[PDB]
Structure 1
Amino acid sequence: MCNTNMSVPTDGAVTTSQIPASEQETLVRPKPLLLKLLKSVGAQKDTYTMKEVLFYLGQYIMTKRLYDEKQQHIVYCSNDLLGDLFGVPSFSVKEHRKIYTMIYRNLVVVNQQESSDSS
């Protein structure tokens, strides 16, 4: 993927997008799990976003030598920090939809304090 700058309306569908990590960002703030994930590669923040975690979690997978050896999409993670994410012996990063949707198991998004008007 290097000739992709505006996509192609020929045998390539409309858009190569899918998964909430840029279009649906969220100023993510998880518990020690995605930060032991990203802060490892190089990250270092009090919070993150699904966009940072997007390309960054992409980093840690491809890195730390946990990936397959066919097309770098069957990334085996036995006893790995990537494992703390879910816990698979292998996961398909190629399908970022299912891979990141199982990343966020329960729930975790931006907080943004609010007020009950009269309080």
Structure 2
Amino acid sequence: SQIPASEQETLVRPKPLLLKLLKSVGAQKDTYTMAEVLFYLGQYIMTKRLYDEKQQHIVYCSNDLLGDLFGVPSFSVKEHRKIYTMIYRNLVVV
């Protein structure tokens, strides 16, 4: 956060639409700190799949020589076994 601590702990009362949204994912109250609002928005965001975590770590290799060699348009940098399998089809163990 580039937001000062004092600001994060500011006590606030969500308007009716923001309140309904927060309670829709389990918020219990009518007043919150700003830190609490952000926690519940985070839950809302993840629940409505407005952010995708897997898609944060993707190589897009279609129409590139790498896509030709691996035989795929995309892959996760976090899935090492899957990369190794694709690499092995392009070499010989000595």
State the TM-score bracket (shorter-chain normalisation).
0.3 to 0.5
1:24 lines up with 2:24 in the alignment: no
Structure 1 counterpart of 2:61: 77
- Closer/same/farther in 2, CA of residues 106 and 71 from structure 1, 3 Å limit: closer
1:40 lines up with 2:24 in the alignment: yes
* Runs of 5+ unmatched residues, structure 1: 1-16, 111-119
Computed over aligned residues only, the root mean square deviation of the Cα atoms, in angstroms, reads 18.4
* d(CA) in 2 for partners of 1:109, 1:50: 56
Q: Is the 8 A contact 1:30 1:108 kept in 2?
A: no
| Same amino acid, percent of matched pairs | 99
Q: Is the 8 A contact 1:25 1:51 kept in 2?
A: yes
Larger radius of gyration: 2
Q: Is the 8 A contact 1:21 1:50 kept in 2?
A: no
Q: What's the CA shift for 1:47?
A: 1.3
* Runs of 5+ unmatched residues, structure 2: none
Q: Which has the larger share of helix? A: 2
Q: Which has the larger share of strand? A: 2
Q: List structure 1 runs of 4+ shifted beyond 4 angstroms.
A: 20-23, 69-110
Scaled by the length of structure 1, what TM-score is found? 0.38
Superposed CA deviations along residues 50-92 of structure 1, whole A, max 9, x for unmatched, are 0111211111011122224654699999999999999999999
Superposed CA deviations along residues 12-61 of structure 1, whole A, max 9, x for unmatched, are xxxxx313677532111121122122101101212112011121111101
Q: Is the 8 A contact 2:8 2:33 kept in 1?
A: no
* d(CA) in 2 for partners of 1:75, 1:59: 27
Secondary structure at the counterpart of residue 28 of structure 1: strand
Aligned length: 94
Secondary structure at the counterpart of residue 52 of structure 1: helix
Q: Is the 8 A contact 2:57 2:77 kept in 1?
A: yes
